From a paper:
We obtained a density map with 3.87 Å resolution from samples of the ACPs = KSs ( = indicates crosslink) dual crosslinked protein, complex A, including all domains KS, AT, DH, ΨKR, ER, KR, and ACP. Both ACPs are crosslinked at the homodimeric KS domains, linking Ser2060 in ACP with Cys177 in KS with the C16 acyl tail bound within the canonical KS substrate pocket. The crosslinkers tethered on the ACPA and ACPB through a 4’-phosphopantetheine (PPant) arm are well resolved within the KS • KS’ binding tunnels, each making a covalent linkage at the active site Cys residues (Cys177 in KS and KS’). The full MAS structure adopts a homodimeric architecture, comprising two catalytic chambers (chambers 1 and 2). The dimerization interface is comprised of the KS • KS’ (2566 Å2), DHA • DHB (429 Å2), and ERA • ERB (1165 Å2) domains. Supported by partial density, a 14 residue flexible KR-ACP linker (L5) allows the ACP to travel between the domains of each of the catalytic chambers of MAS. Due to the flexibility offered by the linker-based architecture, complex A is not perfectly symmetrical. Distances between the active site residues Tyr1912 (KR) and Ser623 (AT), as well as Tyr1912 (KR) and Ser2060 (ACP), are 78.1 Å and 71.9 Å, respectively, in protomer 1, compared with 72.4 Å and 69.6 Å inter-residue distances in protomer 2, revealing a significant in-plane tilting movement of the modifying compartment that pivots at the KS • KS’ core. The AT domain in complex A is in the apo form (without substrate in the active site), consisting of an α/β-hydrolase and ferredoxin subdomains, sharing a similar fold with other type I and type II systems. The absence of observed “turnstile closed” conformations in MAS complexes A and B implies that iterative type I PKSs utilize a different mechanism to prevent premature reloading of the KS domain.
Author numbering:
A (entry chain A): 876 to 881, 894 to 2106
B (entry chain B): 1626 to 1687
The structure:
């Protein structure tokens, strides 16, 4: 036992006055957890990351260093936050840019690159007037109803970031009202850290705590979902050492018009009165990403879809001593129960011990006079004994009109059967329902004729078994390969799950799964490049393997715009940059693949001459040149001269164009002068070699590995060196008799190029293409310029954008110089366009030699192309119709379609719209969209015939269609009237099937329908609508197998605590149409058949959604746990008083062992173990926190033994409980 | 829009700011002396606009 033995600003780490031009202040330090162990508390997603407050103190300290006192920092903004390792290298620099103006940024170099994290201005000393003060007592009076600080800590922790312990303060959050725009809090550093106040202007923990005060907001529901992070503040005004800082005051400027965005609050601090030590202005707090990104994440996590899991029979043969009874309830078919008889034989025989299985058959209902027979035979008397099985036959059925009519009455007879079983009071064994190809299953074998009559049986099964937790129903799907013997073996036990299936010779299980949108599932179309607009693109930056084809759509020739079908295209060096996402994307140009093209004119504009349709033409264009059809300006393109083939033109021009430009216009080669080319093996290098050889000048060159240097000798150029090295310059010096070079073309960076300038002699000319060095601002030392140098940077794209005429003249010039043969093509290393990934590798990895060329097969072909997000959603040339559009969601859809300027909009209200709906429709009609109303009942087939004929008779083809019917009741199965069944089914089915058969010829770009979220389980009462909803999903599968697009969406409001959410926020939600409108727009561009757009994990509906069905794919908790008020005391008082002694004795022993760091004996004194006054204080404070008993040393002295102390505490608890 | 051509003899922040003032493809010609011998740490970043640099001395050219 011994001591461990373990002035500079901590975060800055060191200061240096780099007093060059411009003058720069530089700081270098470390902020890892090894030094700042306290900083480890600030962790988001259990990952230690410093808050943005850390930069603010860094900026304040830097400004104080450079600006002296009265320092201030303006418009600080945060980049991506820093992940705190044990040690982390952090660097900050402040530089003078204008007289009296200094800009300051921070960054962290890593693995040869760097990432900036905060930028701010250091202009300060604006005024001498101290900021005015204000009455703290008046604010405190005006702000009652303060919220406990630890509650805010829990709120932040559950939102993703836990603050640990070192981030104390913010004891209470005082507010004026429920809509108060200003709050204040009492803030102070923890005792363990309070000593650190002498090393900061503002302690980072205290500042972050002040930021945490914003979490109170106008309401506790401010930014109800997700976590917010600060993005910096407009201005920061430090005016006093916060050594004595006690309270902080805020002003929520209510920039959160949505209640979530920005915040833009102002923070002040004070002490005991209207002191103002630090002022914070315009805090970008309610932030984190774009609202579009927020909605994308919300719809990603708010969408659900059932999932099917293959597995062996889980509980096969585990049942024993049962007595089954199989009843066929589908004997309207001639022989449905023949397969069920084997199930009875397997159940009766394979079952161990005296296991048996009776067999029965019956029509589903046949006639009303033969009702209640099932109840008497099984449901009331012969059940109870272990085993009940219900079979509906191996029937398959083409969903025609006859099948639809049969299925409606079939589900009616289903509810008739189930009603009697529900009404029975006795216990019922778990049911075994048998159906063939009717359960909703994975797209595997999700074809045609899938017996939709039997498809809707799911929706009611978990309504009867929700009021009766017993008889837990399990769905099984039958097929020819299901091997019914195994099924009955599974039926012999009945494993606890709801849905099972058989799409091959193996067993399946089904449960709900989260539904994030996939990318390979996107809409496709078999397109012909001969006439269909097609383009290539990358799915995500940084992954070249994600190259994919996308329908580029036809592009008619605009004003003065030419249209060209590509014959060939090349690969620019910038392509790999955009391919890997490291392209200089700052300019927000969103570049694509291809700056160059060659081909034949497809179409001609009106403001264009010279060029004409059919001309051989090549040129440069943006928007990506790797597309079948392209429309751009004529001046960007030049007619190919005769003899000059497109193949040679595309592979030679661009590199030759750049080289000739640099060597003829920027520099001017004088025959015999000395020029050097970096990486001559490159296409541009070969082009420059050709230009120089044409110009008859002395040539030096360099390249990579000796293989890349071999062809250089093969083309017969001397002075060949290794580009990867830097010693080439002095080698040239001695190889040029000490005299330097005249012109130099560089593709290198860093020390390589600066040596190049050092090699330049007198009137040297320097031309650079390297994107990296110029964009990195790693400025070259300009001392060698004294020789009289000229520096040029070249970007053909920039000139093309700004001076199309000049680049056009250059292209014509190089075309002529290639036609006459004075210029040689670099290489003909062609590669397939569809396999451009390996070309990207070859250029990026540079393992290849020479110029890489393409091959463009997509002149005319046939393949499936993934449609983009540009896919048609609104069309002037399109008719649209909605059923139930008078509903709020339908009203929003109509409003957005009219605002979008769609062609025609038809509506149906199942007899006629209500007067208010008619008034809203006529008000919206002034927008010009053809809004028309169709009468009749969707349940009537001729009404749908009208919807396909007369609605189309408005004058446009019908493309967008949707159905939006719904039920308005949640009564249990016993109360269901046939009127409700008819109104739920007949409109739905007579819309779906009739519009499917009656709209085949129409373009029909999309088709969607509404659904209920509980359709997988049924509402506690509603079973009929759930059954109806769990019928369209298979119908969607059936229609997709047919081919036409179809989709379905379940609808659910924002009931995270039920109805109380809306009453707490706005009282009225109409099932969240605003976010649904976004999803509806996305869902139009989606082909997924069915999905549940329902909130999850937040609603009380989660509890039943995870226990009603014993299945689970998402954990029903986020790991956040609450703490009971005096946890041990309540559970202790639950026990009888005699137990209390030992029960609290165990806790006393644990606490004493924690304090003393050693084991103890309850009957022995703490003093003999080493307890002291500090230990006594610790133990009594813990006791107060747990049992709230004022333990005092004289009590401790009398009860120095843990047993006696526990007995005294038990007696005290008994006395106070008696009181 | 900025300027197209700059003939500069100033030093330090003056030329630095003026160099930014150049428009796309601008021409910068330098005639002063202090900066070139001072190895001034200017900013290579604005060269994105396709700038061109020229250091001038009649004596050396002669």
């Amino acid at each position: 036992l011994f001591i461990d033995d373990d002035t500079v600003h901590p975060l800055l780490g060191s200061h240096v006055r780099l007093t060059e031009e411009p003058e720069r202040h530089v700081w270098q330090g470390d902020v890892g957890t090894s030094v700042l162990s306290w900083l480890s508390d600030h962790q988001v997603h259990n990952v230690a990351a410093l808050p943005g407050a850390a930069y603010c103190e860094m900026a304040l300290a830097a400004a104080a260093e450079v600006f002296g006192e009265a320092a201030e920092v303006r418009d600080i903004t945060f980049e991506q936050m820093l992940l705190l390792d044990e040690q982390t290298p952090i660097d900050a620099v402040a530089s003078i840019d204008a007289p009296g103006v200094v800009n300051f940024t921070v960054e962290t170099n890593r693995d040869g690159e760097t990432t900036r994290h905060a930028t701010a201005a250091l202009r300060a000393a604006e005024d001498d007037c101290p900021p005015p003060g204000y009455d703290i007592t008046a604010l405190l009076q005006a702000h009652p109803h303060a919220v406990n600080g630890t509650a805010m800590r829990e709120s932040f922790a559950e939102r993703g970031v836990t603050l640990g312990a070192a981030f104390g303060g913010l004891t209470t959050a005082h507010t004026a009202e429920a809509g108060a725009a200003t709050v204040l809090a009492e803030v102070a550093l923890p005792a363990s850290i309070r000593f650190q106040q002498g090393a900061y202007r503002i302690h980072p923990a205290l500042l972050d705590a002040c930021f945490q005060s914003v979490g109170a907001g106008v309401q506790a529901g401010t930014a109800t979902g997700g976590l917010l992070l600060p993005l910096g503040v407009r201005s920061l005004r430090a005016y006093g050492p916060t050594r004595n800082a006690r309270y902080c005051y805020t002003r929520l400027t209510k920039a959160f018009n949505d209640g979530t965005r920005g915040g833009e609050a102002d923070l002040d601090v004070l002490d005991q009165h209207g002191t103002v030590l630090l002022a914070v202005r315009g805090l970008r707090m309610g932030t984190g990403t774009s609202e579009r990104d927020e909605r994308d994440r919300l719809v990603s996590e708010r969408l659900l879809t059932l999932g099917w899991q293959q597995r062996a029979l889980p509980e096969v043969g585990d049942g024993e001593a049962g007595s089954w009874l199989l009843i066929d309830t589908s004997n309207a078919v001639d022989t449905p129960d023949m397969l069920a008889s084997t199930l009875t034989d397997a159940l009766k025989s394979h079952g161990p011990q005296g296991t048996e299985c009776a067999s029965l058959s019956w029509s589903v209902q046949d006639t009303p006079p033969n009702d209640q027979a099932g109840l008497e035979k099984l449901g009331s008397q012969l059940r109870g004994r272990d085993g009940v099985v219900i079979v509906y036959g191996p029937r398959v059925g083409d969903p025609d009109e006859h099948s639809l009519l049969a299925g409606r009455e079939q589900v009616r007879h289903l509810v008739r059967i189930t009603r009697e079983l529900a009404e029975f009071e006795g216990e019922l064994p778990r049911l075994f329902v048998v159906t063939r190809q009717a359960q909703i299953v994975k797209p595997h074998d999700s074809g045609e004729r899938a017996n939709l009559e039997q498809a809707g049986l799911r929706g009611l099964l978990r309504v009867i078994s929700s009021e009766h937790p017993m008889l837990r129903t399990t769905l099984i799907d039958v097929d020819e390969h299901t091997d019914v013997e195994r099924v009955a073996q599974q039926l012999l036990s009945g494993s606890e799950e709801d849905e099972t299936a058989w799409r091959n010779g193996d067993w399946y299980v089904a449960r709900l799964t989260p539904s994030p949108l996939g990318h390979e599932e996107r809409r496709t179309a078999v397109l012909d490049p001969d006439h269909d607009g097609m383009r290539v693109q990358v799915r995500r930056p940084g992954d070249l393997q994600t190259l994919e084809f996308v329908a580029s759509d036809r592009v008619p020739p605009g004003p003065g715009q030419i249209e060209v079908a590509v014959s060939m295209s090349s690969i620019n060096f910038a392509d790999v940059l955009i391919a890997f996402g490291r392209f200089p994307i700052i300019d927000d140009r969103e570049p694509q693949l291809g700056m160059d093209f060659v081909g034949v004119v497809t179409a001609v504009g009106e403001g264009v001459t010279g060029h004409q349709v059919g001309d051989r033409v090549g040129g440069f264009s943006e928007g990506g040149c790797w597309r079948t059809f392209l429309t751009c300006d004529a001046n960007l393109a030049v007619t190919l001269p005769p003899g000059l083939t497109d193949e040679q033109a595309i592979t030679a021009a661009t590199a030759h164009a750049t080289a000739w430009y640099g060597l003829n216009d920027l520099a001017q080669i004088k025959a015999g002068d000395k020029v050097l080319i970096h990486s001559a093996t490159g296409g541009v290098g070969q082009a420059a070699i050709s230009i120089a050889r044409a110009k008859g000048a002395e040539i030096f060159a360099t390249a990579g590995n000796p293989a890349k240097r071999a062809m250089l000798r093969d083309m017969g150029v001397e002075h060949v060196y290794d580009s990867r090295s830097v010693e080439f310059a002095e080698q040239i010096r001695r190889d040029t008799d000490g005299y330097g070079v005249d012109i130099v073309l560089n593709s290198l960076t860093g020390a390589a190029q600066r040596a190049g300038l050092e090699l330049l002699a007198f009137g040297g000319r320097f031309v650079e293409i390297g994107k990296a060095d110029v964009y990195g601002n790693t400025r070259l030392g300009l001392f060698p310029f004294r020789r009289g140098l000229t520096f040029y940077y070249l970007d053909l794209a920039l000139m093309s954008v700004t001076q199309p005429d000049r680049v056009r003249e250059l292209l014509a010039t190089v075309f002529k110089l290639t036609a006459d043969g004075v210029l040689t093509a670099p290489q003909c290393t062609h590669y397939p366009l569809a396999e451009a990934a390996d070309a990207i590798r070859a250029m990026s990895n540079a393992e290849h030699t020479g110029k890489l060329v393409l091959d463009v097969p997509r002149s005319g072909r046939r393949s499936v192309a993934v449609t983009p997000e540009q896919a048609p959603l609104y069309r002037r040339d399109g008719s649209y119709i909605i059923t139930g559009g008078l509903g709020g969601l339908g009203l929003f859809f109509a409003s957005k379609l009219a605002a979008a300027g769609c062609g025609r909009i038809v509506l149906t209200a199942r007899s006629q719209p209500n007067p208010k709906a008619r008034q809203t429709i006529e008000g919206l009609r002034a927008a010009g969209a053809d809004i028309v109303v169709e009468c009749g009942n969707i349940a009537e087939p001729d009404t749908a015939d009208r919807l396909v004929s007369a609605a189309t008779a408005t004058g446009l083809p019908l493309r967008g269609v949707l159905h939006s019917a719904a039920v308005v009741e949640d009564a249990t199965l016993t109360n269901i009237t046939d009127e409700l069944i008819d109104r739920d089914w007949s409109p739905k089915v007579f819309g779906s099937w009739n519009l499917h058969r009656a709209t085949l010829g129409q373009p029909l770009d999309w088709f969607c329908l509404f659904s209920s979220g509980a359709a997988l389980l049924g509402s506690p009462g509603q079973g009929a609508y759930a059954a109806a909803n769990s019928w369209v999903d298979v119908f969607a599968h059936w229609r997709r197998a047919q081919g036409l697009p179809v989709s379905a969406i379940a609808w659910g409001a924002w009931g995270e605590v039920g109805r109380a959410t809306f009453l707490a926020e706005g009282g009225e939600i109409m099932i969240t149409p605003e976010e649904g409108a976004y999803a509806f727009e996305t869902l139009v561009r989606h082909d997924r058949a069915y999905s549940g757009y329902i909130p999850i994990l937040g609603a009380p509906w989660l509890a039943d959604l995870v226990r009603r069905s014993p299945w689970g794919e998402m954990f029903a908790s986020t790991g956040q746990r609450s703490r009971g008020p005096s946890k041990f005391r309540m559970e202790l008082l639950s026990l009888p008083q005699d137990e209390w002694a030992g029960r609290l004795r165990r806790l006393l022993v644990e606490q004493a062992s924690v304090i003393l760091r050693r084991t103890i004996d309850a009957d022995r004194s703490f003093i003999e173990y080493g307890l002291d006054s500090l230990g006594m204080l610790e133990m009594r404070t813990h006791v107060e926190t747990e049992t709230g008993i004022r333990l005092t040393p004289k009590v401790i002295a009398t009860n120095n033994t843990a047993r006696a102390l526990a007995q005294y505490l038990a007696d005290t608890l008994a006395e106070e409980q008696a009181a």
